[PDB]
Design a protein around this motif. Structure first.
Motif: not given
Ligand SMILES: COc1ccc(C(=O)NCc2cccc(C(=O)Nc3nc4c(s3)CN(C)CC4)c2)cc1OC
Ligand SMILES: COc1ccc(C(=O)NCc2cccc(C(=O)Nc3nc4c(s3)CN(C)CC4)c2)cc1OC
Lengths: 352, 384
Positions: B71, B75, B77, B93, B107, B205
């Motif tokens: 999470r 979004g 995962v 997602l 991002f 991100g």
């Molecule tokens: C291969 O398996 C995986 C690969 C990647 C990830 C992962 O990436 N997790 C973090 C995540 C998940 C869903 C959404 C967001 C998100 O909202 N990420 C966001 N990043 C930013 C946002 S929202 C707005 N802003 C604050 C700057 C950048 C982050 C997890 C996994 O396994 C569990």
């Protein structure tokens, strides 16, 4: 429907020239979007602003690489219409001679009706018939729709009838060519609705080819100013044959059968054709029959040509041409999103 | 000349062009907008054909969701299986509503490109990227060993294991730096393990491309409160100029937490952590008992200093030359080929034992009264 099968099916849609989601049609979408969104009032919206920032230079690069009016050298204006003009052009790079039809997007938006060209595009591009003027390229900018067609140096049949006292032998040839030409249009699933000598052009050999399909309409499932038929003024393909009879009468008499100095007078003459319609017996018989069964008529019985080899025979008038460019046979900023380029998305066609 | 229509890195590629028409149909198909004859007739022509395109193209319905394995802020995962190929993946997602509402809907670009074109054993591979009116989908390789947060919670990590995982992070970050990026959010939550137990970086991100002198200009602090460096933490308008050394600070934070069991600047109050990071000179204390060696303490302190005197300032080789990494089991150029400290015991291709369970709970765009173009920031996201 499981990929890579539906992936191949998707790839076909991007390559098919007849497809509305073809690679060239998809570029039109982005091109139109950039034209319709690039205004200071609209750029206040962060979504519109940032989209335009990303597709800024790349769409300008696309516009440079793609076919444009600047690629063609205009020799002279050879025709004029309600929403545009036809000019004799030469492609600057290939030096190939063509006839370019221009349609004003402003006029098409102002007085509505911006769908008439879709019929003309599909007919000229996918006909592959010696009876239809070939469309090589179709392109557009923010102002016009361009149609790069094969040049017809023989001129129109209006010019032929004005320069010659047309005998019955010549009349038999040109009527027969129109019959075969219109049958090809019907075979494609279309109805002309505006059969006239202005729309009948001649090539370098002096043979007929139909043009100006901006009045055509695609048939459903079964098939449903003086040249107009009483039915138009639900119907089948038999309505275009009326105009053939009008064309044959004018060719032999020198005047249209329902002529009047007042346009309303012609309208009343067409509806009263039974008492309004006033050479040989078989030519008169054909005019009255219209006012395989057409091909079987006694008027077409001759010793010079046959229906299946007519275009291969020598034409009555073969044009005297001196050069490949011989023309002797021719005389607001929006305050909100409006999407003026939207009715023209998917017009671009290139062939091969 | 049609290189712009075939290239997967091109913004005017065949899949990106379809996004334009798809977005246009989504943003124009409203009764208020359909009053405009241009909008109405365009939608009448591209009606069924865009619906046919939507059916043929990759969609969320093509994937069978096994369970939510992660999470994020915008979004989640989920462990997925492609219905047609039966191939197992991890699908991320991202909420288009949340990205539009909170702004910052740009991002994911560098994250899409890093995962798609890294071709490094240190970066999680992105196979497909697609979208609908609600979400952005990122089909990635599944990491069955879980994250390093889960490893540190389930194991009492010795120095030999700590030496391995720190070294893998060093090599992983150097690859991201070589691609011209600063991670800016190095943490164990973003450190994942494959079926073999080897490290791979995820969540790009926060990634930002460096200039020709390896620098970045940012007026907004980015990352996690415990792992953020002082230079990034104090970043604001006028004072936000930093290099790749901010990622090395986080490595020192990660190494400390791995050996101590707690973050070096922990506080129950978040502003307390902020204060502790800024006062790192007098704030960094090691637990009184001591068992974590002299050279391990030396490395933590070498990273946990001011940028101008931080290890890594003169390249990655000075980090690799440190006495802490001197061992008889592995070498820097063959480290990922050696056997990992924890190799996951897997029963199936959909084994989620190394991932905890997550609970449940969405919002949608209001119907527009005029053109808004909510799908416009996402045109060109589709890949492979
Ligand atoms: C291969 O398996 C995986 C690969 C990647 C990830 C992962 O990436 N997790 C973090 C995540 C998940 C869903 C959404 C967001 C998100 O909202 N990420 C966001 N990043 C930013 C946002 S929202 C707005 N802003 C604050 C700057 C950048 C982050 C997890 C996994 O396994 C569990
Ligand atoms: C290769 O040889 C040629 C092929 C075709 C033509 C041709 O087509 N000529 C008539 C024409 C020219 C330019 C514009 C329009 C026009 O505006 N035509 C229009 N048609 C409609 C309009 S505007 C509005 N609406 C009421 C429905 C029908 C018509 C000419 C040629 O050269 C001799």
């Amino acid at each position: 429907m499981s990929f890579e099968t539906r992936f191949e099916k998707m790839d076909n849609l991007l390559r098919d020239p007849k497809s509305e989601v073809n690679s060239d049609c998809l570029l039109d979408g982005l091109d139109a979007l950039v034209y319709d969104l690039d205004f200071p009032a609209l750029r206040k919206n962060k979504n519109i602003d940032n989209f335009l920032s990303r597709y800024k230079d790349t769409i300008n690069k696309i516009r440079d690489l793609r076919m444009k009016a600047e690629d063609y050298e205009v020799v002279k204006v050879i025709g004029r219409g309600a929403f545009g003009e036809v000019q004799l052009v030469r492609h600057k790079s290939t030096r190939k001679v063509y006839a370019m039809k221009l349609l004003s997007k402003f006029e098409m938006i102002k007085r509505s009706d911006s769908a008439f060209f879709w019929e003309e595009r599909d007919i000229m591009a996918f006909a592959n018939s010696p009876w239809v003027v070939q469309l090589f390229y179709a392109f557009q900018d923010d102002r016009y729709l361009y149609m790069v067609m094969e040049y017809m140096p023989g001129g129109d049949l209006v010019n032929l009838m004005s320069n010659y006292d047309v005998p019955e032998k010549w009349a038999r040839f040109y009527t027969a060519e129109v019959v075969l030409a219109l049958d090809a249009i019907h075979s494609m699933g279309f109805i002309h609705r505006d059969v006239k000598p202005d729309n009948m052009l001649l090539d370098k050999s002096g043979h007929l080819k139909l043009a100006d399909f901006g009045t055509c309409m695609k048939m459903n499932k079964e098939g449903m100013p003086d040249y107009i038929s009483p039915e138009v003024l639900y119907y089948g393909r038999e309505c275009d044959w009326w105009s053939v009879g009008v064309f044959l009468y004018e060719m032999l008499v020198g005047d249209t059968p329902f002529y009047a100095d007042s346009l309303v007078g012609t309208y009343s003459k067409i509806m009263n054709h039974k008492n309004s319609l006033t050479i040989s017996k078989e030519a008169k018989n054909l005019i009255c029959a219209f006012l395989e069964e057409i091909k079987r008529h006694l008027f077409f019985k001759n010793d010079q040509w046959a229906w299946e080899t007519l275009r291969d025979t020598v034409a009555p008038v073969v044009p005297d041409l001196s050069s490949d460019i011989d023309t002797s046979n021719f005389d607001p900023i929006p305050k909100a999103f409006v999407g003026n380029q939207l009715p023209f998305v998917g017009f671009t066609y290139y062939s091969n």
